Amino acid sequence: KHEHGVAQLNVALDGKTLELELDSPAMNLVGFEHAASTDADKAAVAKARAQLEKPLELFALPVTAGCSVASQELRSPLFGHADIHAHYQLSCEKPELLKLLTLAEFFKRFPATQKIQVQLIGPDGQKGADLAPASAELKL
Ligand SMILES: [Zn+2]
Ligand SMILES: [Zn+2]
């Protein structure tokens, strides 16, 4: 799907491993999808790329759970419709303390995003949910 204002989040939590795949039209992240001609356009892309480099902050992961970034890919053309793909593998020393997942911070920092669609998979099974700025929590 490429619906402006909607992003997909796949989440896989197995023991100490946390895996996060975000797919999004750029419209909700930089505010356009045209090539980055100008240099008030180039700044807008650098800002986005920077917030996407700090997943512990953007996904508001508890510090209690001792989560570390193992690895991180950010593919996009901007790095005539355009997507942005972000992939993160994370290692958490105390995953028992990963109770909830808030996209509150995400909606804060990319407010042109109206909805995120979450797949979660753990050893417990598969969970699905539309998150909105109102309703932005999911129980793991
Ligand atoms: Zn588009
Ligand atoms: Zn990927």
Numbering used by the authors: 15 to 93, 119 to 179
Task: Please share excerpts from the published article on this structure.
The structure of PA4063 in complex with zinc was solved by soaking crystals in zinc acetate solution since crystallization did not occur in presence of zinc. Later, a higher resolution (2.85 Å) data set was collected from a zinc-soaked tetragonal crystal, confirming the positions of the two zinc-binding sites and allowing a better determination of the complex geometry and coordination distances. Site a is located on the flat surface of the β-sheet in correspondence with the histidine residues. The same mode of binding is detected in all three monomers of the hexagonal crystal: besides His124 and His126, the zinc ion binds to Glu87, likely as a monodentate ligand, and a water molecule, adopting a tetrahedral coordination geometry. The water molecule is not visible in the tetragonal crystal, where zinc appears to be coordinated by only three ligands. Comparison with the apo structure shows that coordination requires rearrangement of the donor side chains, which move closer to the site, while Glu35 is displaced. Site b is about 20 Å from site a, on the edge of the β-sheet where the His-rich sequences are inserted. Notably, a few residues belonging to these sequences, which are disordered in apo PA4063, become structured and take part in zinc coordination, although some variability is present. As for site a, the coordination is tetrahedral and three donor groups are provided by one glutamate, Glu47, and two histidines, His16 and His18. The fourth donor was modelled as a water molecule in monomer A of the hexagonal crystal, while in monomers B and C, as well as in the tetragonal crystal, the electron-density map indicates His120 to be the donor.
